[PDB]
């Protein structure tokens, strides 16, 4: 039904890339892709369905390994192909659990042996993926070697030798490819729930100011334009969190992707000054604490996250502004924690404080901001603060119709809320 509006091409210096073959407007869906392979990530193991990656109140463990959990038999049956070979591996590893990259690659090798050409590889295959093999530092090669051994041990029940996989496949190279090509999979409210490989989507080079963005529906990846784009214009996404200083961005791009970004934001340290508002002596502590805090959120430990956040927020109220990114991230965690713990009034407290900083650091239309605004607007609505909510709901609608698309369930809710809210306002 739908014309393909993107194509692979060779760039001057970034290797291959993806570009528009037709003019594109904001919100326009460019690509829908299934994973070559994917898995729930460590922190969400028993929290979301192994298959559809949805959070369901109550999940059924696979009777054999008791590691994989599903929201229904339909999901358990749909997953058995992808699960067959790991089930034994997982059961035996117990009480151990392998790194995600190991479990992920474990699913990949079997997909590689399909005869049904992968829909996820229509533009680019696993074997085309960049490994950056010649640019890896010795520290990295070492860690990769370890992953290789861990794989050999983890898969030993199913694979004993190289001849049981395709001749072109190489473990060391596979892991290198995995580090720089895997996508973290997020639910609709941009919470991290998994990781996957989407080889065709892997063509997109990075920019700290991208013209496209990505949102998932379960393991399905949707790529959209968030900006007007011209024929022949390279399509880009941002590989990184938006709340990072030019220097943090440089380091992670170096360490994980073996390149330095020359985008205009990196040239000019764009917003670095705002991000670091406050005294380094103070906000350094906050940056440190964030390590533990975010590891806790990855494991959905909301009580624990709230406590750490409260101590930090309380203690800094007199000397550190909310626009400082480390402090901002602590507020964002605090809010999410309160929302999950039914502390709604208090969520509104922390949430309102992220609003202006988010508008600044998440320019334009970004799914992360769209969802933030949506949450605050809903919290407002809940507290009866109608004209405030209405303003925010309207704004979330405007952002998310572009980042999530009109057919999205979250847009459905928004419209209903805008209506209930607009009613109470013109009844006031």
């Amino acid at each position: 039904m739908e014309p393909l509006k993107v194509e692979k091409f060779a760039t001057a210096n970034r290797g291959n890339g993806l570009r528009a073959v037709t003019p594109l407007r904001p919100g326009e869906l460019l690509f829908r892709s299934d994973p070559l392979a994917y898995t729930v990530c460590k922190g969400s193991r028993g929290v979301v369905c192994d298959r559809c990656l949805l959070g369901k109140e109550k999940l059924m463990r696979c009777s054999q390994c008791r590691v994989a959990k599903y929201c229904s038999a339909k999901c358990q049956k749909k997953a058995w192909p992808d699960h067959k070979r790991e089930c034994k591996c997982l059961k035996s590893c117990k009480p151990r659990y392998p790194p995600d990259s190991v479990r992920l690659l474990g699913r990949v090798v079997f997909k590689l042996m399909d005869g049904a050409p992968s829909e996820s590889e229509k533009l680019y295959s696993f074997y085309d993926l960049e490994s950056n093999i010649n640019k890896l530092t010795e520290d990295r090669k070492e860690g990769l070697r370890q992953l290789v051994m861990t794989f050999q041990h983890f898969m030993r029940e199913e694979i004993q030798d190289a001849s049981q996989l395709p001749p072109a496949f190489d473990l060391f190279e596979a892991f290198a490819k995995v580090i720089c090509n895997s996508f973290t999979i997020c639910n609709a409210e941009m919470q991290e729930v998994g990781v996957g490989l989407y080889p065709s989507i892997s063509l997109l080079n990075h920019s700290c100011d991208p013209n496209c963005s990505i949102v998932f529906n379960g393991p399905h990846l949707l790529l959209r334009a968030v900006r007007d784009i011209e024929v022949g214009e390279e399509l880009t996404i941002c590989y990184l969190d938006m709340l990072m200083t030019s220097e943090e961005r440089r380091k992670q791009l170096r360490d994980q992707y073996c390149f330095e970004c020359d985008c205009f934001r990196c040239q000019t340290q764009d917003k670095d000054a705002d991000m670091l508002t406050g005294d380094e002596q103070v906000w350094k502590e906050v940056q440190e604490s964030l390590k533990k805090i975010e590891e806790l959120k990855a494991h959905w430990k909301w009580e624990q996250v709230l406590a750490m956040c409260q101590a930090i927020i309380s203690s800094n109220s007199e000397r550190l502004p909310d626009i400082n990114i480390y402090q901002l991230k602590v507020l964002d965690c605090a809010m999410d924690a309160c929302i999950n713990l039914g502390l709604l009034e208090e969520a509104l407290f922390y949430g309102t404080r992220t609003m202006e900083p988010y508008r600044i650091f998440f320019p334009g239309s970004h799914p992360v901001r769209g969802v933030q605004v949506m949450k605050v607007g809903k919290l407002q609505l809940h507290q009866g603060m109608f004209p405030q909510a209405m303003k925010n709901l309207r704004l979330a609608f405007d952002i998310m119709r572009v980042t999530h698309g009109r057919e999205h369930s979250l847009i459905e809710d928004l419209i209903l809320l805008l209506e209930e809210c607009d009613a109470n306002i013109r009844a006031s």
């Binding site: 990530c41 790194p99 995600d100 990259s101 995995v178 580090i179 895997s182 996508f183 973290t184 999979i185 997020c186 941009m190 990781v195 996957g196 963005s213 990505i214 949102v215 996404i237 941002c238 590989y239 990184l240 969190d241 938006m242 998440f362 970004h366 799914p367 992360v368 901001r369």
Partner: peptide, 7 residues
């Protein structure tokens, strides 16, 4: 963190 971020 394994895998590209989304924001």
């Amino acid at each position: 963190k394994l895998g590209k971020s989304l924001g």
